[PDB]
Amino acid sequence: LALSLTADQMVSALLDAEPPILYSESMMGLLTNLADRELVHMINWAKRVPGFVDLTLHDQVHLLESAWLEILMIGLVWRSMEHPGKLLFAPNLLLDRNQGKSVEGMVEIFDMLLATSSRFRMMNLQGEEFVCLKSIILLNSGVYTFSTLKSLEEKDHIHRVLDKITDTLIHLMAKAGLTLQQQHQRLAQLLLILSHIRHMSNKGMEHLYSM
Amino acid sequence: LALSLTADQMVSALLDAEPPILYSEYASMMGLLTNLADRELVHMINWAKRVPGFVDLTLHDQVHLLESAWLEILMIGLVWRSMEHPGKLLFAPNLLLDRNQGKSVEGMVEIFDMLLATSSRFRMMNLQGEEFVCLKSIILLNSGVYTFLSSTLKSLEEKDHIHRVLDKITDTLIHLMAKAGLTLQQQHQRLAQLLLILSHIRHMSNKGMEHLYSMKVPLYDLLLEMLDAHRLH
Ligand SMILES: Oc1ccc([C@@H]2Oc3cccc(O)c3[C@@H]3CCC[C@@H]32)cc1
Ligand SMILES: Oc1ccc([C@@H]2Oc3cccc(O)c3[C@@H]3CCC[C@@H]32)cc1
């Protein structure tokens, strides 16, 4: 099981499961089409996340239905890091704030995504940390919304895996040369950003469902 | 000055700052819940002003943070006092409601279930009072930090301060866990478990806002009115 993997094995498995960066094939049309194609790759990526396939199909579907937008958004923010002021939806679709005003209700979300990307840049987020965070989102997002006996076991499994990913993040920070205090401070800084990603996803859904 | 406090002083400060538990007044379930939340807001501002470092910020930034986090703060408070009442939500000592009593208002039951699950999680983790106050302060400082308007030197200075205080609370959380006898690995694991729940609290607040808006002076001006006090008294 995933509970037996080592910190380096975890990082390795995660880096390998990384989906491909797709290209865009009016604006909403392009964003949703892109999202639709990425979803297919997300599902394959998910199954590769240590511990995911150990859950019931029903629960696998639940976690994905709950975390897909947060997962797409953290990916967007990650590839937009080296591009201050712009969101790299796709290599051939790099948009700025003004282009966001185009659609209604869209710029407010663009601004939050931009701010998040800036925070990651400021923190100098590493690719190893990024994959860990994305996996955390997948497992954490829908766990608080699955009282049956079967649920107990599922949740227990999820939490153990999450603990493993936490150890991995800490491990990465240790090898990076951070002091213990710096380590736990960065761990918290990174997890607190997940709350903002949840927020952006909620708003993204409000914007999506509003049309 | 808040950045020089020790872990123990940080904890004592937060504990001392705790707001009072209000009673429901008296039925319109929403009327009761909203009136209760309205009266608690007044006390929330007093509590916020007592959170180390909060008053060093500008009035504008203080209002923005509270406008962003008020419902999360009310909800974590609710979940906290509901910990000893499995299956029920203790909105107030005289307003303990169960799941079915939530079906009396469309779209309320889904939120109730989320709050109830959060309460069970806290109970399952044996959340400590010292940890609860640290978490509530983190919500206050973190929820709206990523949505600050300007990027002026002043703004950059405020964000630096907020992140510095947040690091301090993180230090305090780890200190509490260390004194509890947990190993370093258990400390890091619990810290993560606690912070991930804030993601769920953020989620509930958003669903709560959507619900509140389904049943519509702007909140900002109301918070500003109360935060912008004079010194004649
Ligand atoms: O990889 C990605 C990441 C984000 C997007 C897009 O992000 C945004 C951002 C702002 C407003 C939106 O409606 C969307 C839509 C809503 C669904 C997602 C899609 C598309 C592809
Ligand atoms: O201390 C507290 C905590 C929560 C509440 C109530 O919590 C809920 C829960 C579910 C649906 C709601 O509309 C509310 C309303 C929306 C505003 C808050 C209020 C009231 C007082």
Side-chain angles (χ1 to χ4, degrees):
Chain A
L1 274 292
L3 304 183
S4 61
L5 298 172
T6 64
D8 291 307
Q9 292 182 305
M10 179 62 91
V11 177
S12 178
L14 294 177
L15 288 175
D16 284 66
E18 276 296 274
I21 295 182
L22 307 186
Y23 278 72
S24 175
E25 266 178 283
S26 184
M27 196 176 284
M28 277 304 294
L30 293 172
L31 298 184
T32 61
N33 165 273
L34 174 61
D36 290 322
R37 282 180 288 131
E38 278 183 287
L39 286 176
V40 177
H41 288 282
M42 191 186 295
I43 300 177
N44 291 313
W45 159 75
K47 291 178 164 59
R48 302 278 297 297
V49 179
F52 193 71
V53 292
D54 300 308
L55 300 167
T56 178
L57 300 179
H58 177 291
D59 287 327
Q60 281 174 52
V61 175
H62 182 264
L63 291 182
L64 280 175
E65 165 170 44
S66 169
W68 72 276
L69 188 47
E70 289 178 82
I71 290 161
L72 288 178
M73 285 179 167
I74 192 175
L76 171 62
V77 171
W78 167 253
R79 53 186 191 266
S80 298
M81 265 185 79
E82 302 165 298
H83 301 284
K86 301 167 177 178
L87 295 170
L88 196 56
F89 285 96
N92 71 330
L93 191 62
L94 162 154
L95 312 175
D96 61 39
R97 179 170 205 296
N98 302 311
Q99 290 170 292
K101 299 179 183 180
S102 177
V103 178
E104 207 153 21
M106 176 177 277
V107 73
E108 1 296 329
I109 298 166
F110 258 52
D111 289 323
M112 297 187 277
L113 290 165
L114 287 171
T116 309
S117 196
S118 292
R119 187 65 206 302
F120 278 168
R121 186 186 315 133
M122 189 179 269
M123 289 184 79
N124 193 28
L125 181 64
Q126 300 296 295
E128 291 72 26
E129 297 178 306
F130 169 70
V131 296
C132 284
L133 292 181
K134 218 197 324 183
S135 296
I136 287 176
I137 289 173
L138 174 63
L139 301 175
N140 187 233
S141 294
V143 77
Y144 306 117
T145 179
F146 274 152
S147 183
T148 65
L149 301 184
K150 185 54 182 181
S151 72
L152 288 185
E153 296 298 67
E154 295 284 277
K155 292 190 178 182
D156 183 61
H157 175 66
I158 291 179
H159 291 310
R160 295 203 205 178
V161 177
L162 282 169
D163 284 345
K164 209 96 190 73
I165 299 175
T166 296
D167 306 327
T168 300
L169 272 171
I170 289 297
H171 174 250
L172 292 170
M173 290 172 233
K175 279 193 171 181
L178 305 187
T179 68
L180 282 173
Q181 179 180 55
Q182 295 182 312
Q183 292 181 48
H184 72 218
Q185 287 184 178
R186 185 175 183 79
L187 174 61
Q189 290 163 186
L190 296 175
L191 300 183
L192 285 184
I193 292 172
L194 295 196
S195 276
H196 190 237
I197 290 168
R198 172 55 124 294
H199 182 64
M200 296 192 288
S201 175
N202 288 326
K203 290 289 186 178
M205 296 290 262
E206 288 184 53
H207 181 266
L208 189 54
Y209 287 15
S210 183
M211 53 180 273
Chain B
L1 69 178
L3 301 185
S4 59
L5 291 176
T6 62
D8 296 300
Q9 298 177 304
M10 181 69 249
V11 170
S12 302
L14 298 183
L15 290 173
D16 274 64
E18 279 296 274
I21 292 190
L22 303 190
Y23 276 71
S24 180
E25 216 175 309
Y26 66 69
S28 185
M29 199 50 76
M30 281 305 299
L32 294 180
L33 297 180
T34 55
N35 175 277
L36 174 64
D38 290 350
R39 276 180 292 129
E40 285 185 277
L41 280 174
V42 186
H43 292 284
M44 183 183 306
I45 286 170
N46 292 324
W47 161 77
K49 286 162 50 58
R50 303 247 294 184
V51 173
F54 191 77
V55 295
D56 299 316
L57 298 173
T58 64
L59 179 64
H60 168 282
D61 288 353
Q62 283 178 47
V63 180
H64 179 275
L65 289 178
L66 282 165
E67 175 177 49
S68 170
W70 70 274
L71 190 54
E72 289 176 83
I73 292 163
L74 288 184
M75 290 179 167
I76 194 172
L78 169 63
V79 174
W80 170 249
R81 49 186 193 268
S82 292
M83 271 194 347
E84 297 188 302
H85 305 284
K88 301 183 180 182
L89 295 174
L90 194 55
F91 286 96
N94 70 321
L95 193 61
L96 183 57
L97 311 181
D98 62 58
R99 181 175 195 297
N100 304 305
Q101 290 173 295
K103 298 180 180 178
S104 57
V105 179
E106 191 175 351
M108 182 184 271
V109 72
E110 306 64 36
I111 304 181
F112 261 59
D113 289 330
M114 291 187 282
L115 291 164
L116 287 168
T118 308
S119 201
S120 301
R121 173 65 177 167
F122 277 160
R123 192 165 52 241
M124 169 168 66
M125 294 179 67
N126 214 302
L127 184 68
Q128 300 294 303
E130 296 71 31
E131 298 176 315
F132 163 71
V133 299
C134 283
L135 288 179
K136 211 204 312 178
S137 285
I138 286 174
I139 292 176
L140 173 64
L141 296 171
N142 176 255
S143 295
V145 74
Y146 309 111
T147 54
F148 274 135
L149 173 61
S150 300
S151 56
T152 50
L153 209 200
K154 190 179 195 175
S155 202
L156 296 177
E157 298 180 319
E158 298 263 277
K159 289 175 182 175
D160 176 77
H161 177 64
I162 290 170
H163 286 315
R164 269 175 153 65
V165 178
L166 283 167
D167 285 342
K168 208 96 179 77
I169 303 180
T170 293
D171 293 334
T172 306
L173 273 173
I174 285 297
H175 174 260
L176 293 172
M177 293 172 195
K179 280 190 165 176
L182 304 184
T183 60
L184 281 182
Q185 173 179 50
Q186 300 175 324
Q187 287 172 47
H188 304 317
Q189 286 177 173
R190 187 178 181 75
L191 175 65
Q193 299 171 187
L194 293 176
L195 299 185
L196 290 180
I197 296 178
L198 297 189
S199 171
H200 180 60
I201 291 177
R202 178 62 129 294
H203 184 65
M204 295 189 290
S205 169
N206 288 323
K207 303 317 299 182
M209 304 283 245
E210 283 172 44
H211 185 258
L212 203 54
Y213 279 75
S214 293
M215 325 184 103
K216 301 192 193 193
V217 57
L219 182 57
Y220 183 100
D221 283 295
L222 209 178
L223 296 174
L224 176 60
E225 164 62 41
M226 300 186 283
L227 278 166
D228 187 18
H230 55 57
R231 305 196 278 235
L232 314 179
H233 301 163

